[PDB]
Amino acid sequence: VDPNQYYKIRSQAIHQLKVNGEDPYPHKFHVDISLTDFIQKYSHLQPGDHLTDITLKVAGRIHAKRASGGKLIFHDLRGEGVKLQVMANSRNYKSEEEFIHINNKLRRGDIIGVQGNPGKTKKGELSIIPYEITLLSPCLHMLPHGLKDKETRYRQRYLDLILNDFVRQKFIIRSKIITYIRSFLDELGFLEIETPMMNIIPGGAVAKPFITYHNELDMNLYMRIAPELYHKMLVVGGIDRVYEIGRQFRNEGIDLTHNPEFTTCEFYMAYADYHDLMEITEKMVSGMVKHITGSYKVTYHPDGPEGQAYDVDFTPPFRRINMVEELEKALGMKLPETNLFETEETRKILDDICVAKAVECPPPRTTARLLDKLVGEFLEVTCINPTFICDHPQIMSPLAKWHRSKEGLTERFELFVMKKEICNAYTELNDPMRQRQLFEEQAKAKAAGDDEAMFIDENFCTALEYGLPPTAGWGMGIDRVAMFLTDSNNIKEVLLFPAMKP
Amino acid sequence: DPNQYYKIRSQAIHQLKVNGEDPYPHKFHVDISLTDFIQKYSHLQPGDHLTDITLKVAGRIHAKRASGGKLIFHDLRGEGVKLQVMANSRNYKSEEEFIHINNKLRRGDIIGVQGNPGKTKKGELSIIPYEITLLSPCLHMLPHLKDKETRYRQRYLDLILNDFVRQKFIIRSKIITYIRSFLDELGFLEIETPMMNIIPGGAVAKPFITYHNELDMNLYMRIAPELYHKMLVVGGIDRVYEIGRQFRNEGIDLTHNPEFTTCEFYMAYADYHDLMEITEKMVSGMVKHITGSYKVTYHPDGPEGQAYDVDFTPPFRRINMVEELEKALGMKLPETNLFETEETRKILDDICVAKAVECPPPRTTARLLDKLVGEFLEVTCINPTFICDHPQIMSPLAKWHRSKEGLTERFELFVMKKEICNAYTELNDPMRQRQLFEEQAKAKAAGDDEAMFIDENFCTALEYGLPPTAGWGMGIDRVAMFLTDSNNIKEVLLFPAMKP
């Protein structure tokens, strides 16, 4: 009854079968039909039926084994997210002696192959009356009673998938999101590409990277934090529309919305601006929600199942707000003119404001970091429905093109849904001279203690000197999308094997 | 002089900014692509000029030929297509502006063209512009590009000047899209598993090591996702697949890049025999669907060498590794149940020395066998060939062969002398898997940097019950190589790894 004792007893038993030549891990079992197809094919049977003219082979894991005498055993077979009952009757088994022998060997959790006839019990339960049951793979451990401890579910995802059917549904939704994006972009003529994940200098975002070393080339390398720079070089190369759904690596802390490795979808469209991208984003996100959930409305539980429930409407158009103007409205005070957002005086003003508003910001207390903390405190929390926060200051967007009418701002937007950032996009900065200037400013910030400041990428600047057409780029966090599409407040729910403390 | 051109063009572009001429405009509205423009106006006759139709197109200037002072021809290219821009002063918005824009434009500049469709007296489809806008200038002089180093170091230049490069990458994307479609139709669930692991596994390879600061932990970049996939099958997801990057800290060569893409899939209740049939159907169907024929031309010695047509029509040839190795060597090898003895290792060592087959330390049986197979069997696999029943000593994760002692239910697919797929009936016995892991740990301590680490978490997962399963792995880059008649993996990688 003790788990460790159960494991020792079952292990010795299975080992005995091996020495005796009983083959507890057979090489092959021919499955004639899946459980799902079996259910749809014989669900029309009537209570008490027993189809003696059809013999099929099925397989699955034993979820329960209840004895109804010495000659009747019921096995609850599960697989493919469905259930199928195995009505093991001694009179129908190949022999009474073998009926007792196989059932005494079976335990809950074992993988078995079943050869029998379809039938339905007197109570109306579809079943398979077996002629022969074969042990395919025994379960040496005791399975949980259920399984609710988050730590165990995340450290042994196979147990979570075996015991909780809602978990499989979340990962099916996640795959539907990725497949929907690929179909959407492929239809628009985008070419799916793959760019390096190991870089001499990481770039395309503000983040601390992972460091590794290549022996044969005697070189230090960084895991990519974003593929943005390689994508723009491809647009310079003449591939007007490219996209890539892949992993990004950021050596930062783990929390409800951050994992060291995560999946994003980045795409670049030549001859487009951030205004075109807002419309494309509205069409893609709203259509994705409708296609997967059936409607434009989604229920949101910010405080778990026992909390308030909010209806989130994804019907376009999405609301748009300007970051600086809304931040001033939230603070009830006017901020400096946008063309002064790069001065030290503006940094001191924002620093003082953060202190007075109890908005914390760990060093370095740079304008970009202080603004980010203020936006997360006063604007992000109010973005329940899909909201576009636009025209970010240049100081927070070293790769975005300057705003054509608002000095000091950029043609950028971020899509927020259920208090989380989903997309990051902007009109691409294609002026090589101005890009190098912003890179030089980033290097100074880095040399002064900023682990996330960008490195100067001269190779990328050189590519921009060859001519990058006016372009608009976009990045979406696939994990974050799966979170709001599965009503999950923790990113670990949408990652098969999330990063964990040892 | 290239540098002088860059300095002069830079000052000219800088002057445009100070003069308020916006050399990098924010938005240009394209009415139709170059491809659609050509297909839509293919019916014109020489001398035609549809003055009642105005369209806006865009592209890069590849050539600029002057004819008079009032006529300039711009060769606009984009999307792998070309469109001539017949800039006539009489048709431009104004003669003064015609001279101004043309004095600013140079070869390589990205421009927007607003004009009418037309055809020259010589019969060339063109666009007669009303206004030309400089969208993004090219500050460098372009090659009037064959140097491999430059093509791989500045892939944008390669893509701008040689159309065959873009075609290879379109084929590469078609391969991946085809596999997803094939597997999705068979009920496989596309999944994503960790690329950063506490313990690397799923292959015999040297990994990359990194460090997580917030958690003060050493991490390894994944060398294969195999172990996570099998854990997913234990979890009840009978069919999973993942097309993603793998990282191996090894040397670069014609068929190896430190980061590469593979497609791995696991299907419960199948064995390696079922996987051979699936491989034949997928590979043959993919070759036919993308290239139009079941045959592909292969140039092992470049364009000026022998060309062999390889037929991908199933079934593929099957050969047993040990049996054909004996025939290729003309010598009888030890019995398969003796492959773990020191006497067998010495025997394989002598054979390698006598046949001049090199093998860097450690000279273990598994490594000596791998060298002999690559020298006597792989080179002879031009047509799609399955090499099967590898010894257990070289397959720590494959299930033992049900009839041949010492062998496993494993196979490798070889095409045009390159390894394409690696598959086998999965070992689902946790005690025997742990034993093989212990043997791998011994080999690691004895000089084999590629030997596997013991993964107790995976062994524990096998203790919960892994149904009989067969797994498979395919090198996407290698497939793109043989599908584009490329002998260097750098041809099918947008940015291949390069020495600084």
Ligand SMILES: NCCCC[C@H](N)C(=O)NS(=O)(=O)OC[C@H]1O[C@@H](n2cnc3c(N)ncnc32)[C@H](O)[C@@H]1O
């Ligand atoms: N050219 C326009 C910008 C393109 C995208 C840009 N290169 C970029 O990296 N933007 S990002 O905000 O830094 O990341 C893109 C999205 O990835 C999501 N994400 C980002 N970091 C994490 C982390 N740590 N965990 C989980 N999800 C994350 C998040 O939704 C972002 O909106």
Ligand SMILES: NCCCC[C@H](N)C(=O)NS(=O)(=O)OC[C@H]1O[C@@H](n2cnc3c(N)ncnc32)[C@H](O)[C@@H]1O
């Ligand atoms: N469970 C059955 C086996 C599944 C696949 C197994 N985990 C595996 O990794 N096999 S592999 O041979 O080591 O890699 C799979 C394929 O990736 C290809 N490949 C392997 N190494 C490289 C490298 N360095 N560069 C480019 N391509 C590579 C190669 O074609 C392989 O056939």
